[PDB]
């Protein structure tokens, strides 16, 4: 299940719109260092 | 022509969500709240009447002025009259402040005043104490800051220093001087105030002072007026206001209105439907209006809003200033007021009086039914005319405090609530004004009403207020006003426009406020909201969903109720809604629902995965606004399973 | 916990109640300055439609006038003419140059934001009649919209952007319907409604090769879609998705450079593959009406609905501008990978491999 939701966040990480890509990158980077 | 094709074309990506930024408006510093509420706990009536004796300084005329507190002292004999005036004076004050310990001092000594003031200070150390001084029977106050009392035998006028008098009384206190050269007392009081400030290095703003006259001026000797002209004004305004009205040149315009008809005016000062209660109500409106237009906002809330009795004294002081001016007398106040005697509203007061007591011949003799004054109607008409071209931020409407006074009755309550809403609509600057004038505790009191006609008006008014000042969520929960709105949100016949405002009001009361979340949960909001979740109105669907999301924000009890009702299932329908506002609000609520799992039973985990996959099918969505909230929603999923998502992240490395 | 971000959505929504409600909106005001400037734009538009229609009735003369010749930093990939305001957006691989053809000056210079592998294939002008926008579909899928693109007092502003799909990418704007049909390497033609910002219909293409071109018809559902293998399908979205396919005629074998449709009720799909042979099909017929063979190695082509000029290109610098019947008019002597007609004026842009942009005119 988490694999699927992490793949979703990858799509939001590569968003055309900058604001969505930025906020998605912050939340995705806040996982890595835990 | 080829113009109808142009006008009839959808402008794609040209709406509020596109042009304006998706950002919250910065809340202004709401300073309307009162810092503290004062309570006048006790009152000191020091009466140096010296009935039956005349002060040597002033050679009184043979008629002179005899009436004191509307009592002829020489009719009753000396001793009884002094007791009677003290009793009546208490009653008069009890009209304005009925719940205070009164303690009369009748021709007192110095020790008597010392023990009196020190006792009242002990009773209310931190609360205001009123000191009333009536020096009509003693010589005029000296330049050296002294006030005269008697000796035990009543054979010598003993002086009393204002310094020692302001020693025994404490810091929060108010002083009323009704004597001839009363300005001298105020000057020397401020001197000893400055003298104390100089001694403090190696009690001024707190101490209020009212004085009948300037130091040079003398009190009027006119047989028509009562000797207690100042106190009467402060304590029985309507009584002298009508007697003064009958003394001016404008009486020629109304023949057959003497003082004898004024004596026998019917009614009371409470019943606003009577003729006497009408004038008292009008007078309270006119005085509160003059004050708001003339004084700076800071000093208005200091004097006219903090505590009732002070506000009443200053209200009636404005009338004293006008009347005494017409006899070469200038009253004096410690917080100096700008001259209000020439205000336009005073002219309106004359006409209001004129029309009210032109009927008295027919009311007394013929027994005609008292028709009410058009005053409040015409003032609301003026406020409405202002609103028509009121879009610009011009000078505020003079009549705003009258609209407040109109809310107190029922006769014009519907019209006022309408206009007040129309005004608040103009902008957030206006709602700030209406909160500063002090509309809040009256709009909140109307939530105790059951008149269903009020329901659409109060819903409107409260949405505008809570949009500006969200802190009022505290007050609405205390008074159980959230039940009033719950009823409106469960009324199919109420239009969907007003039901939308109700859902916003609830979404503010609940917003990040555990007391409001616990209170609305017990009022069964989630069940009511789900009943309205499939309405044909996209504004309601949006807010109802945000409201649903906020109630279970870090509150597992509101989540469990959602699980029983199975809200998350009913919310998936909004995930395919046409309007992208609703889709976004739906993503918000489903995210906030997930975020507060707090390691519950296994059921929760299977539900969270069901809510995940239903959200995980909103990736290929056109609006990035929705996709942004989709991240914040999936943030809640990461926060709940931070230990689990670390396992997935480490795998693919 | 500081990583917890909170959007301003719930706070922005509450702003709806701070603004006034009861009063008449600014648009309904007949004497408002926005409506008068909008009526002035619509008055200028109706004039430009009338003046251009009068030139068409006079016929089309030979077109050889060069208004200007400037040079861009990048290769011109796709060109479009704004219908009324003279704004000729000439995008490049890593920028979008906005040129002019009356002053003759550089007005703006964007960066699209797409990676190095991607390329801006298609471009449109949304709301061309007034308050126009610029849709910019990237080949990988990314679509994005730019406002205030050639303004004095304003900067670049990306309105919205969303990954579509997932040749490159092809688009056909439909102002009146409000729809937008993305397509490319996938075997699907999505139809993104921009009022509901959701994919309404997913029409199956029924074709292995990539949808190289895509053109539709106003006031009807006639989605034409050329393909890389050669075929030109037609799908009607009114019927069921399985039944959406209507005709499948195949008389080519190459990438379709530009399967363009005319706005008339007598629709004619003028398809020209890399082979360079024209075959005028109809939607109501099973086989071609006319046949033409023009250039052996065709690279890029353009057509104009109002004037039936098939603006061809050539490897050998030629620019053959023939009619649909196949008559010779001009052979303008200079990979000419972008030509672009105006929707109204008979102006024809051309763009060779060299980064040089011209603007021609018919006297």
Swiss-Prot record, chain C:
PTM info: O-GlcNAcylated by OGT upon glucose sufficiency, promoting interaction with small GTPases Rag (RagA/RRAGA, RagB/RRAGB, RagC/RRAGC and/or RagD/RRAGD) and subsequent recruitment of mTORC1 to lysosomal membranes, leading to activation of the mTORC1 complex.
Q: Which residues carry this modification: N6-acetyllysine?
A: 147
Which tissues does it occur in?
Highly expressed in skeletal muscle, and in a lesser extent in brain, lung, small intestine, kidney and placenta.
* Modification Phosphoserine occurs at: 32
> What subcellular compartments does it reside in?
Lysosome membrane; Cytoplasm; Cytoplasmic granule
Query: What are the start and end residues of each WD repeat?
Result: 70-111, 115-156, 167-202, 206-245, 251-291, 293-333, 335-363
Q: How does it assemble?
A: Part of the mechanistic target of rapamycin complex 1 (mTORC1) which contains MTOR, MLST8 and RPTOR. mTORC1 associates with AKT1S1/PRAS40, which inhibits its activity. mTORC1 associates with DEPTOR, which regulates its activity. mTORC1 binds to and is inhibited by FKBP12-rapamycin. Forms a complex with MTOR under both leucine-rich and -poor conditions. Interacts with (via TOS motifs) EIF4EBP1 and RPS6KB1; interaction is independent of its association with MTOR. (Microbial infection) Interacts with vaccinia virus protein F17; this interaction dysregulates mTOR.
Report the function annotation for this chain: Component of the mechanistic target of rapamycin complex 1 (mTORC1), an evolutionarily conserved central nutrient sensor that stimulates anabolic reactions and macromolecule biosynthesis to promote cellular biomass generation and growth. In response to nutrients, growth factors or amino acids, mTORC1 is recruited to the lysosome membrane and promotes protein, lipid and nucleotide synthesis by phosphorylating several substrates, such as ribosomal protein S6 kinase (RPS6KB1 and RPS6KB2) and EIF4EBP1 (4E-BP1).
Regarding protein family, the annotation reads: Belongs to the WD repeat RAPTOR family.
The protein's name: Regulatory-associated protein of mTOR
Which organism does this sequence originate in? Homo sapiens
Q: Which gene encodes it?
A: RPTOR
Which region of the full protein is contained in this chain?
951 to 1331 of 1335
